[PDB]
Design a protein around this ligand. Structure first.
Ligand SMILES: CC(=O)N[C@H]1[C@H]([C@H](O)[C@H](O)CO)O[C@@](O)(C(=O)O)C[C@@H]1O
Length: 208
């Protein structure tokens, strides 16, 4: 009667985020005596009674400062959803995790058989720049990053290149950038670095 559906292993590139689909079941008669349903995710081998949860829907339970905001329960727990969302992954997050349910004095249960193994790989993904290119046009660029979440603390950008003097010599921190390619700027390496408060992406210009 106590079942938990979730993949056993999961991978995420440090700094990015992933969504761990999860579903769970437990015996519940369903009559009006309806005490609240509290679920938790813990680090492997911790004791429910004394541990700060990595994630929970219990308003009284203290959450690990390290996971506050990065690990969040998605979906309605009242609808069998234990889906987890890990954001701004960190190497420290690597390890095993388990889910627990509690409802009334009777329902209490840790799914120690269905642990969740999380491996935090290194960040190899490169930012992105998203077809004009006319000498004298107000083209606007945008340097974002795939697999990113607005989980942790906002990212920081800084553009590099020789073609950064035609206009503002300081308004180049924004994610998006407006620029009118002045002629001389052709086949010039344009870069965009990023940090989470340092990977980059270099592209070659082309004016016509
Ligand atoms: C009897 C029951 O349904 N739940 C029991 C659970 C689960 O059997 C295990 O966590 C499964 O791994 O174990 C406990 O130690 C717990 O964590 O509270 C006692 C609790 O009564």
């Amino acid at each position: 009667v106590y079942e938990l559906q979730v993949q056993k292993s999961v991978t995420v590139q440090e700094g990015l985020c992933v969504l761990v689909p999860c579903s769970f079941s437990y015996p519940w008669r369903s009559w009006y005596s309806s005490p609240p349903l509290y679920v938790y995710w813990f680090r492997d081998g911790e004791i429910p009674y004394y541990a700060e949860v990595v994630a929970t829907n219990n308003p009284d339970r203290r959450v690990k400062p390290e996971t506050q905001g990065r690990f969040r329960l998605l979906g309605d727990v009242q609808k069998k959803n234990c889906s987890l969302s890990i954001g701004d992954a960190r190497m420290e997050d690597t390890g095993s995790y388990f889910f627990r349910v509690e409802r009334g004095r009777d329902v209490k249960y840790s799914y120690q058989q269905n642990k969740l193994n999380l491996e935090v790989t290194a960040l190899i993904e490169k930012p992105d720049i998203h077809e004009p290119l006319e000498s004298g046009r107000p083209t606007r660029l945008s340097c974002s990053l795939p697999g990113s979440c607005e989980a942790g603390p906002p990212l920081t950008f800084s553009w590099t290149g020789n073609a950064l003097s035609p206009l503002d010599p300081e308004t180049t921190r924004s994610s998006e950038l407006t620029l009118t390619p002045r002629p001389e700027d052709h086949g010039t390496n344009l870069t965009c670095q990023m940090k989470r408060q340092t990977t980059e992406r270099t592209v070659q210009l082309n004016v016509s």
